[PDB]
Design a protein around this ligand. Structure first.
Ligand code: GLC
Ligand code: GLC
Ligand code: GLC
Ligand code: GLC
Ligand code: MG
Ligand code: MG
Ligand code: MG
Ligand code: MG
Ligand code: MG
Ligand code: MG
Ligand code: MG
Ligand code: MG
Ligand code: MG
Ligand code: MG
Ligand code: MG
Ligand code: MG
Lengths: 386, 386, 386, 386
């Protein structure tokens, strides 16, 4: 079993299966892929769609006429395969002009160029049917303390996103923005380094309803944070617009392993949350097939992303459906966590002698939470020992 | 030089110099301090004031009459010394009843008790003149994925803070709340683990203007994050209500070293930011004298906190005042970062051929940022080699 | 299935199920256990044996006569249950006298006391039949750079272990020593912080054959290291004398979760290695039932340790036995890794034009390693999807 | 002041100032440097010498005749400047053929090629006068557990180093080997990941006296370890043959900042140790000028490396020479740490009732260590406040 179909909404970036394997210490180990061949191969594996940076699809520097030819060939492969394009993004990190950032570069003329390069691709994204436009400010940041006044940089970041929201509103486009946090790499520290920082920043934009987050498994784990907790907070705020799925082994460089590798139990709890909460966006894989692999390994790695999601989906569903787990959840008072603390209101709480004066603190303290039995039931389900 | 006076607004928690040195592997190495003696000794060192948890000042379980005696003796030492109490907080972590949290415990009766214990201390804090009430949800969190539904927990957390804001508004108190994030320890993962997560959560409260953050140097460094960057974002949002100063050597257990130890360059850039931005709140030290020390070492460690702040203040001021640094800041285009990207507006930007069609991307890319020369000037200033 | 029996050699420290739940921020949540009751309960769960620190079994300060009574009652419970005692250790960390270390304390009289306290327990360990004596130098280390000259400290550490080896040799005891590394906590940095540092240090002892390592899953993961790789290096050196099994979620305080929690894939590869290499020592759990739990949760957590080991043992065995995995291992050239690079010798290698002058570097470079297919077969086996 | 001269023995790799700024997310920002121009510029700054990989000096694939021309031009620049070449190394990581390692690649023919490529450069290194040959096994490792049997890989690693020792012995060369550890990047985990693992491995080689370590500041800090402690252990073992100096901000990708940046207090304690212990090898900088910089920034960054070493040398010397620090060191019993624990021997220790039966454990426990006063004196010296 565990066969994906387009209805599972699995998507991949062109830059994922197309990563040629150049890393900071080594040359490329694979030839470049034509975007048309990636679309065709991914469709055969059961993917729903692809995503792109402007510069993945149109080589930097292309003339308007080469640009039209590149888009036309791409559109033909989408039509031939039934593949969709649900998200697009801008490359504001590879070209040397962006070495100190795009939206927050110290040079004003670079910031203006960054905005114009972005706006050009938003038009293209809308034409291809994308619903989400992602921004990853990978060069926005610093290696040293005096290089960047962060309050001024956040003013420039707000200014840029405000202008993009003005642009989409005045064009009447039906597209929303998602900010993708990352704590470091390639800059020593990156601005808006976690889900939380990005959520807080969105609330200071002029039109906050147009902006959400695009969290990545590996990025929050590069700060040692619990990725399902961060996703829960994004869902609670109503801001999970898109998600990047992959694997990471702890606090180190961004590995972008296939989804399911890295922290397997966190992948289980993530899938449990996304499915329980009814997340209906794309399940997007931002991963790199390791540079040890040839092209057969690339497609095996991509297939593995989808397979692991579907296995974990089955295990999480079996967990939540198990009557014994339902009993254990009540034993651990998960039902009580969902009930208001004081629906009776402040005055009733202040007048309630059972909440303080007569509260038996020692009897409450002696109650075990039964969390270890619950967690072993979850382990047994994950391993198929139930 | 480097002598503190009460005008520098240095404050200390009772639990800092009073830490008896019990750690998870060892017994206490120091006897308990009477709060009155800590107030007297800190005043002699030049401190401005002290802070407290309810249970530092009034032993848990005290009768209303013992409670009055404890507060009266404390007030007498404040009157005798001129020491202030600018901040107070609640202990919702030591007693076993709080083993699964206070505001987000799964048991509803514990959550109600947590709120009543808090409200009782807010009254006391106002009576002693505190302007900020800190909340550190050290037990709010989980060791395993099924133990805590985080969306329900955030509902309970919002409910608790909303009720506290209703309480202070209806009493007419002039006190604000500050949430203190920490990513982990003593729970495996703690809810609202960073400055950013706390800032985002505040924007969903019913009266957000009453709530800010109380960031701690060491806590953001336990996630590998840049503490001055996080403080800059808190200042940008207008939410830096209080701060906890200490030192930490990287990603490990919360060390709470004296301020200046740990990451010294980050301490320099923090002081530079606080002084430049005109932060006028207390400079509060949340630190633990190591359990190797006797009481003479306790007071040396506390004195060192203040000394290091004043040395770094002098060095940061000399840095910003140095004409050569002013020249270097312009060389690195810090002045241009502070200028709007597009004060001319969206349409002018779209019509500006110098922002895209005629932009010379190769010439812009060749401009060096001169950040390494600027950073060596900052190093020279820090080390007193300028 | 997955029922342990004494033949699986699962052992537990008295301090594990007996941890009362005191952490740096909270009081104990469980009453103390009598060592006799822990022995009885563990035997009912299928354990093979228990381990102890001197101070777990004999309260610190006991008279020689109380000491005999404590040992006699303990021996009676071992006789009644059939439980063995394969390992023992000394507590050189809890008492305040050890605040700057035992073997490497700066005070010479403390170092002498530490040695005498150790020697007294080696006699007891031999009397109870222990084959391994573990040393965990949890207080050997420093919070600041000038407090400890590390070369002098390593001289003192070598001196102490040399004297212990002289003691066991002159008494004719059949016991070996195992050093347990940990990188930090409770000291800011601990001497011999990893498996590698401990292995290197052993080679400078006077009788290296008497000393090996006792690595702990969570400790190597507190440095972000790969625990199965470190165990492989300890096996390669012939020095894996004992092992501590538990779980840890990344780089943070020492969590001591039950085995199987934390990094589940690393637990799978660890079990694969131990079973393949024929490790025949005790499978020892050094874990803490979380302080959320009552005593029913303690025993569930302990049972879970053993269960997870036996599930992973089954999955790793099914992986290695699967013909398709055998085919994939050959596809990835694991067979070639096991063959000597140059059994023909140096001169033949220098004369072999196919190794350099005529080596087709581009054809070799194009060969994919097929590691992603192999790793997905391992995932499928772990999850029971094969 | 703080002007370097060739007598300070500062050296730089050709690949450091010559790094073109290509990172995993971006193109090069600087043109390639001719090795002859780097030698000339470094000599003007006061450097002592340069180091190289084979492929930095001779482009991969060069004919024997182009090879001679490249070496001749290089030798002429050394003669013209007086620059020395104290260390050389092999590039076994950039070419795609090395994607699964050099000495421990699964393919046997790649391992043989790796050895031949190394041996060819050892001859060249000896001809240029290098005394140390460094090996950094950056590709030796794995992203997944089944890809590499680590015991077989360590057999292949021992085999390769044994063959290199046979080669240098039979040629009569006066060159020693130094292994450079790194825990990860570019492989997910790298074999011999820390100083300790490398020291332990050397003791299993056939001729251990020919092998030492070349530790790098940033690499040990990528595992959160204390770099001066690791250097002390390497000095204690007599194995510090060479050192790589740079800066790193905590646990993240390898930043290779200029020396003095990153953890400044650790740089102070490192310099204190190297100078106190009389390390007489090269002070080698393995650093990357950030890709924000133009060539003027490159040379400023290199100059900063040397400047910061000389400032810290002055501060550490003033610390050790200060009578008040000498008094504090005795107060903290550093003198007693240097005295044998039991020069009187085992029997005398066992017979000494003052070591146990009559030892006053409470009085010893009450003695403070005075480490915080000592550490503030060290801070005051570092900051020039003494
Ligand atoms: O912006 C989309 C993608 O851009 C870059 O490739 C980043 O490395 C990746 O994290 C991000 O998701
Ligand atoms: O709530 C005030 C203090 O409470 C606890 O002591 C925490 O450990 C500390 O971080 C916090 O600042
Ligand atoms: O020495 C045996 C045990 O001692 C202490 O309890 C440590 O916390 C543990 O890691 C170690 O294994
Ligand atoms: O081998 C010498 C150098 O090789 C590589 O460039 C590594 O990145 C560096 O760490 C090492 O020191
Ligand atoms: Mg990533
Ligand atoms: Mg990414
Ligand atoms: Mg991404
Ligand atoms: Mg803290
Ligand atoms: Mg704290
Ligand atoms: Mg605090
Ligand atoms: Mg542990
Ligand atoms: Mg442990
Ligand atoms: Mg242990
Ligand atoms: Mg490096
Ligand atoms: Mg390096
Ligand atoms: Mg190096």
């Amino acid at each position: 079993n565990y066969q994906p179909t387009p209805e599972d909404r699995f998507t991949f970036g062109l830059w994922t299966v197309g990563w040629q394997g150049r890393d900071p210490f080594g040359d490329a180990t694979r030839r470049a892929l034509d975007p048309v061949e990636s679309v065709r191969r991914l469709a055969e594996l059961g993917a729903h769609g692809v995503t792109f940076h402007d510069d993945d699809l149109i080589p930097f520097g292309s003339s308007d006429s080469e640009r039209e030819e590149h888009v036309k060939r791409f559109r033909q492969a989408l039509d031939d395969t039934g593949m969709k394009v649900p998200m697009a993004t801008t490359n504001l990190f590879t070209h040397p002009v962006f070495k100190d950032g795009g939206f927050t570069a110290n040079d004003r003329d670079v910031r203006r160029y960054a905005l114009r390069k972005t706006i050009r691709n938003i038009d293209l994204a809308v034409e291809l049917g994308a619903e989400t436009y992602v921004a990853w400010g990978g060069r926005e940041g610093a290696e040293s303390g005096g290089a960047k006044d962060v309050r001024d940089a956040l003013d420039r970041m707000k200014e840029a996103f405000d202008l993009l929201g003005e642009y989409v509103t005045s064009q009447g486009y039906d597209i929303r923005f998602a900010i993708e946090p990352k704590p470091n790499e390639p800059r020593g520290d990156i601005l808006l380094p976690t889900v939380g920082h990005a959520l807080a920043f969105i609330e200071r934009l002029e039109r906050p309803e147009l902006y959400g987050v695009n969290p990545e498994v590996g990025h929050e784990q590069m700060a040692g944070l619990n990725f399902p907790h961060g996703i829960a907070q994004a869902l609670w705020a109503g801001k999970l617009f898109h998600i990047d799925l992959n694997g990471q082994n702890g606090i180190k460089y961004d590995q972008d392993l296939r989804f399911g590798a890295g922290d397997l139990r966190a992948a289980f709890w993530l899938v449990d949350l996304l499915e329980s909460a009814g997340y209906s966006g794309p399940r997007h894989f931002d991963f790199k097939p390791p540079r040890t692999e040839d092209f057969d390994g690339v497609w095996a790695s991509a297939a593995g992303c989808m397979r692991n999601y579907l296995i974990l989906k089955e295990r999480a569903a079996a967990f939540r459906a198990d009557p014994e787990v339902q009993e254990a959840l009540r034993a651990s008072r998960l039902d009580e966590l969902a009930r208001p603390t004081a629906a009776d209101g402040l005055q009733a709480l202040l007048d309630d002698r059972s909440a303080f004066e007569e509260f038996d603190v020692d009897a409450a303290a002696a109650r075990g939470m039964a969390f270890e039995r619950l967690d072993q039931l979850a382990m047994d389900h994950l391993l198929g020992a139930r």
